[PDB]
Coordinates of C-alpha atoms (C1' of nucleotides) in Angstrom, one line a residue:
Chain A
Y442 CA 22.0 21.8 -19.8
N443 CA 24.4 23.4 -17.3
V444 CA 22.9 26.0 -14.9
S445 CA 25.9 28.4 -15.0
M446 CA 25.2 30.1 -11.6
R447 CA 23.1 33.2 -12.3
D448 CA 20.0 31.0 -12.1
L449 CA 21.1 29.9 -8.6
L450 CA 21.6 33.5 -7.4
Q451 CA 18.4 34.7 -8.9
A452 CA 16.4 31.8 -7.4
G453 CA 18.1 32.2 -4.0
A454 CA 20.1 29.1 -3.3
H455 CA 22.7 31.1 -1.4
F456 CA 20.4 31.5 1.7
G457 CA 20.5 28.8 4.3
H458 CA 19.1 28.3 7.8
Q459 CA 20.0 30.1 11.1
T460 CA 23.5 29.9 12.4
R461 CA 22.5 28.3 15.7
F462 CA 21.0 25.3 13.8
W463 CA 24.1 24.7 11.6
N464 CA 25.9 21.4 11.2
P465 CA 29.6 22.0 11.8
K466 CA 30.5 19.7 8.9
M467 CA 29.3 22.3 6.5
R468 CA 32.2 24.7 7.5
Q469 CA 33.8 24.1 4.1
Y470 CA 30.8 25.2 2.1
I471 CA 29.3 27.9 4.4
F472 CA 32.2 30.3 3.7
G473 CA 30.6 33.1 5.8
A474 CA 27.4 34.6 7.2
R475 CA 26.1 38.0 6.4
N476 CA 23.5 38.0 9.2
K477 CA 22.0 35.4 11.7
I478 CA 21.4 33.4 8.5
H479 CA 24.2 31.5 6.8
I480 CA 25.0 32.3 3.2
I481 CA 26.7 29.6 1.1
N482 CA 28.8 30.2 -1.9
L483 CA 27.7 29.0 -5.3
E484 CA 31.2 28.5 -6.5
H485 CA 31.5 25.1 -4.8
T486 CA 27.9 24.4 -5.7
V487 CA 28.3 24.7 -9.5
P488 CA 30.8 21.9 -10.3
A489 CA 28.9 19.5 -8.0
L490 CA 25.6 20.2 -9.7
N491 CA 27.2 19.8 -13.1
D492 CA 28.8 16.5 -12.1
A493 CA 25.4 15.4 -10.7
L494 CA 23.8 16.2 -14.1
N495 CA 26.6 14.4 -15.9
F496 CA 26.0 11.2 -13.8
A497 CA 22.3 11.5 -14.4
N498 CA 22.9 11.7 -18.2
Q499 CA 25.1 8.6 -17.9
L500 CA 22.3 6.8 -16.1
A501 CA 19.8 7.8 -18.7
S502 CA 22.1 6.7 -21.5
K503 CA 22.5 3.4 -19.8
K504 CA 18.7 3.3 -19.3
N505 CA 19.0 3.0 -15.5
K506 CA 16.2 4.4 -13.4
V507 CA 16.5 7.3 -11.0
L508 CA 14.0 7.5 -8.1
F509 CA 12.8 11.0 -7.0
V510 CA 12.4 11.7 -3.3
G511 CA 10.6 14.7 -1.9
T512 CA 8.0 14.6 0.8
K513 CA 8.1 18.2 2.0
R514 CA 5.0 20.3 1.6
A515 CA 6.6 22.9 -0.7
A516 CA 8.8 20.6 -2.9
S517 CA 6.2 17.9 -3.5
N518 CA 4.3 19.6 -6.3
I519 CA 7.4 20.7 -8.1
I520 CA 9.1 17.3 -7.8
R521 CA 5.7 15.9 -9.2
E522 CA 5.7 18.2 -12.2
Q523 CA 9.4 17.5 -13.0
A524 CA 9.1 13.8 -12.3
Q525 CA 6.1 13.4 -14.7
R526 CA 8.1 15.4 -17.2
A527 CA 11.1 13.1 -16.9
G528 CA 9.0 9.9 -16.6
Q529 CA 10.7 8.7 -13.4
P530 CA 9.4 7.0 -10.3
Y531 CA 8.7 9.2 -7.4
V532 CA 7.7 9.4 -3.7
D533 CA 5.7 12.5 -3.1
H534 CA 3.8 11.7 0.1
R535 CA 5.1 10.1 3.4
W536 CA 8.0 7.6 3.0
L537 CA 6.7 4.2 4.0
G538 CA 9.3 2.3 5.9
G539 CA 11.5 -0.3 4.2
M540 CA 10.2 -0.3 0.6
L541 CA 13.8 -0.8 -0.5
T542 CA 15.1 -3.1 2.2
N543 CA 11.9 -5.1 2.3
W544 CA 11.2 -5.2 -1.5
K545 CA 9.2 -8.4 -1.3
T546 CA 6.2 -7.2 0.8
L547 CA 5.1 -4.0 -0.9
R548 CA 4.5 -5.5 -4.4
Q549 CA 1.6 -7.3 -2.8
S550 CA 0.1 -3.8 -2.3
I551 CA 1.3 -2.8 -5.8
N552 CA -0.4 -5.8 -7.5
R553 CA -3.7 -5.3 -5.8
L554 CA -3.5 -1.5 -6.4
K555 CA -3.0 -2.3 -10.1
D556 CA -5.9 -4.8 -9.9
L557 CA -8.1 -2.2 -8.3
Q558 CA -7.2 0.4 -11.0
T559 CA -7.9 -2.2 -13.8
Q560 CA -11.2 -3.2 -12.1
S561 CA -12.2 0.5 -11.9
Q562 CA -11.3 0.8 -15.6
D563 CA -13.4 -2.3 -16.3
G564 CA -17.1 -2.7 -15.6
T565 CA -16.6 -4.7 -12.3
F566 CA -17.1 -1.6 -10.2
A567 CA -20.2 -0.6 -12.2
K568 CA -22.0 -3.8 -11.3
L569 CA -21.4 -3.2 -7.6
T570 CA -23.7 -0.7 -5.8
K571 CA -22.8 2.7 -4.5
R572 CA -21.9 2.2 -0.8
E573 CA -19.0 -0.3 -1.0
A574 CA -18.1 1.1 -4.4
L575 CA -17.4 4.4 -2.6
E576 CA -15.7 2.3 0.0
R577 CA -12.8 1.0 -2.1
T578 CA -12.8 4.2 -4.2
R579 CA -11.6 5.8 -1.0
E580 CA -9.5 2.7 -0.3
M581 CA -7.8 2.8 -3.7
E582 CA -7.3 6.5 -3.4
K583 CA -5.4 5.8 -0.2
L584 CA -3.2 3.2 -1.9
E585 CA -2.6 5.6 -4.8
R586 CA -1.5 8.5 -2.6
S587 CA 1.2 6.3 -0.9
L588 CA 2.2 4.4 -4.1
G589 CA 1.6 7.0 -6.8
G590 CA 5.1 6.5 -8.1
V591 CA 6.2 2.9 -8.0
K592 CA 3.6 0.8 -9.8
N593 CA 5.7 1.0 -13.0
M594 CA 8.9 0.0 -11.2
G595 CA 9.7 -3.7 -11.4
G596 CA 13.0 -3.6 -9.4
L597 CA 15.3 -1.6 -7.1
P598 CA 16.1 1.8 -8.4
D599 CA 19.7 2.2 -9.5
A600 CA 20.1 5.7 -8.1
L601 CA 18.2 8.0 -5.7
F602 CA 17.7 11.8 -5.9
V603 CA 16.6 13.3 -2.6
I604 CA 15.6 16.9 -1.9
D605 CA 16.0 17.1 1.9
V606 CA 18.6 14.6 3.3
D607 CA 17.7 15.5 6.9
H608 CA 14.0 15.0 6.4
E609 CA 14.4 11.8 4.3
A610 CA 17.2 10.4 6.5
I611 CA 15.5 7.0 6.4
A612 CA 15.6 6.8 2.6
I613 CA 19.4 7.5 2.7
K614 CA 19.9 4.9 5.4
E615 CA 18.1 2.3 3.2
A616 CA 20.0 3.3 0.1
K617 CA 23.3 3.1 2.1
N618 CA 22.3 -0.4 3.2
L619 CA 21.5 -1.5 -0.3
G620 CA 24.6 0.2 -1.9
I621 CA 22.7 2.2 -4.4
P622 CA 24.2 5.7 -5.0
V623 CA 22.3 8.9 -3.9
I624 CA 22.4 12.4 -5.3
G625 CA 20.9 14.7 -2.7
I626 CA 20.5 18.3 -1.8
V627 CA 22.3 19.2 1.5
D628 CA 21.4 22.3 3.4
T629 CA 23.1 24.2 6.2
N630 CA 21.5 22.0 8.9
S631 CA 22.1 18.7 6.9
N632 CA 24.3 15.7 7.3
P633 CA 26.3 14.7 4.2
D634 CA 27.8 11.6 5.7
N635 CA 26.3 8.9 3.5
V636 CA 25.6 11.0 0.3
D637 CA 27.7 9.7 -2.6
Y638 CA 27.4 12.9 -4.6
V639 CA 27.1 15.9 -2.3
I640 CA 25.9 19.1 -3.9
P641 CA 25.0 21.9 -1.5
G642 CA 21.9 24.0 -2.1
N643 CA 18.8 25.6 -0.6
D644 CA 15.8 23.5 0.4
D645 CA 13.3 26.1 1.5
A646 CA 13.2 28.1 -1.8
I647 CA 10.5 26.8 -4.2
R648 CA 12.5 28.5 -7.0
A649 CA 15.6 26.7 -6.1
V650 CA 13.7 23.4 -5.8
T651 CA 12.2 24.0 -9.3
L652 CA 15.5 24.8 -10.8
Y653 CA 17.1 21.6 -9.4
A654 CA 14.3 19.3 -10.4
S655 CA 14.0 20.9 -13.9
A656 CA 17.8 20.4 -14.3
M657 CA 17.6 16.7 -13.5
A658 CA 14.6 16.2 -15.7
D659 CA 16.3 18.0 -18.6
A660 CA 19.4 15.8 -18.0
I661 CA 17.3 12.6 -18.2
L662 CA 15.4 13.8 -21.3
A663 CA 18.7 14.8 -22.9
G664 CA 20.1 11.3 -22.4
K665 CA 18.2 10.1 -25.5
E666 CA 20.2 6.9 -25.9
Chain B
rG1453 C1' -19.3 -21.9 37.4
rU1454 C1' -16.6 -17.0 37.5
rC1455 C1' -14.0 -12.4 36.0
rG1456 C1' -17.5 -11.2 31.5
rU1457 C1' -20.0 -10.5 26.1
rC1458 C1' -14.3 -7.8 29.5
rA1459 C1' -11.6 -6.3 24.4
rG1460 C1' -8.0 -8.1 23.6
rC1461 C1' -4.4 -12.4 21.9
rU1462 C1' -0.9 -13.3 18.0
rC1463 C1' 2.2 -14.3 13.3
rG1464 C1' 5.3 -13.2 8.4
rU1465 C1' 9.1 -9.7 6.4
rG1466 C1' 11.8 -5.8 7.3
rU1467 C1' 14.6 -2.2 10.9
rC1468 C1' 17.1 -1.3 16.4
rG1469 C1' 19.9 -3.9 20.2
rU1470 C1' 26.4 -8.0 21.8
rG1471 C1' 22.0 -10.2 23.9
rA1472 C1' 17.2 -11.8 26.3
rG1473 C1' 14.0 -8.7 23.3
rA1474 C1' 11.6 -4.3 21.0
rU1475 C1' 8.6 -1.9 16.8
rG1476 C1' 3.6 -3.1 14.4
rU1477 C1' -0.7 -3.0 18.9
rU1478 C1' 2.0 3.7 19.4
rG1479 C1' -0.3 9.6 19.5
rG1480 C1' -5.4 12.8 18.1
rG1481 C1' -10.8 12.0 17.4
rU1482 C1' -14.9 8.5 17.3
rU1483 C1' -17.3 3.8 18.5
rA1484 C1' -20.9 -1.7 21.6
rA1485 C1' -16.0 -2.9 20.1
rG1486 C1' -7.9 -3.5 18.5
rU1487 C1' -15.2 -0.3 15.2
rC1488 C1' -13.4 3.2 11.8
rC1489 C1' -10.4 7.7 10.2
rC1490 C1' -6.0 10.8 10.4
rG1491 C1' -0.6 10.9 12.6
rC1492 C1' 3.4 7.5 12.7
rA1493 C1' 10.2 2.2 10.6
rA1494 C1' 6.6 0.1 9.9
rC1495 C1' 4.0 -2.9 5.8
rG1496 C1' 0.4 -6.8 5.7
rA1497 C1' -2.2 -11.1 7.9
rG1498 C1' -5.0 -14.7 11.5
rC1499 C1' -8.2 -15.6 15.9
rG1500 C1' -11.3 -12.5 18.8
rC1501 C1' -15.6 -7.8 17.5
rA1502 C1' -19.4 -7.4 13.5
rA1503 C1' -22.0 -10.8 9.8
rC1504 C1' -23.7 -16.0 8.5
rC1505 C1' -28.4 -19.1 12.4
rC1506 C1' -33.7 -18.5 15.2
rU1507 C1' -37.9 -15.2 16.4
rU1508 C1' -40.9 -10.3 15.8
rU1509 C1' -42.6 -5.8 12.7
rU1510 C1' -44.3 -4.1 6.3
rC1511 C1' -45.4 -6.3 1.5
rC1512 C1' -45.4 -10.3 -2.6
rU1513 C1' -45.9 -15.6 -4.8
rU1514 C1' -47.6 -20.8 -3.9
rA1515 C1' -51.2 -23.6 -1.2
rC1516 C1' -57.7 -23.6 0.2
rU1517 C1' -58.8 -28.1 4.9
rU1518 C1' -60.4 -29.9 9.9
rG1519 C1' -59.2 -23.2 9.2
rC1520 C1' -61.9 -18.2 6.8
rC1521 C1' -67.1 -15.6 5.2
rA1522 C1' -66.6 -9.9 1.4
rG1523 C1' -70.6 -10.8 -2.6
rC1524 C1' -75.2 -14.4 -4.0
rA1525 C1' -79.0 -17.8 -2.2
rU1526 C1' -81.6 -21.0 1.9
rU1527 C1' -82.4 -20.4 6.9
rU1528 C1' -84.7 -23.8 12.8
rC1529 C1' -80.9 -17.1 12.8
rG1530 C1' -76.2 -21.2 14.8
rG1531 C1' -70.7 -20.6 8.3
rA1532 C1' -76.1 -24.0 10.3
rU1533 C1' -76.6 -25.2 4.4

RNA sequence: GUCGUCAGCUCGUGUCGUGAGAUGUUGGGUUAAGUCCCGCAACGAGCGCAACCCUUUUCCUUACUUGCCAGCAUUUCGGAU
């Protein structure tokens, strides 16, 4: 299920952000800059991506669960399609604070979200008239948008997979606090300090995002034990 | 009594701070209103607001006197009978 490299170049993972917005810790991976935009080598990217896929396969073989983190506008739909494909919990919309460090509270929300969904499936909503029915149809849609991923989860995820570390800095902080490993995509303007498995790649390109997400989904599906 | 029927006052768990403490309650609209909706390391609660109580406006059921008189009859023309 390896990506080789040619997929990365054709997608466009080599492009980064502008030079003036770079993080100096990336000096090892940047390797140069053709123009006012940094261009990162894929030679260092490839082994890190392959090792990330290997660790994901190990997790799937051990039946451990990998949470998917993307809240950016562009990457949300792709991480949705691939997360449904891999059958893994996901966070597509805004990251609500402390779901991991404050595990106890949010399952109140989860159980009454499940109860609302089951009531909607049943005839309870049918008895009730249109106004307030529309009221918690809206209300349940609001719970569903924030918690579309984690009804099925019964415990802390064993590993995280994050698209933009700089954008989802809070999630990495919580994961670091809890000790759970994180596989994340780090860009030119990103901080790799607390990422256990650091693989560098583009975050703006929807093609690159799709390739990354599809690779992880294929790894989980190819676990098969 | 008064500010004044002014709209605020708080807690649990998480995060930040050596600490007293802070966040939630913040920003954009809207509303009688911390009323509601988006944004947001916050997620949810309680008392306040609103509703539950009384009265007025439309209709229905039950009740027909000491109250009522559409139809019938008698009238001293007064539901007087």
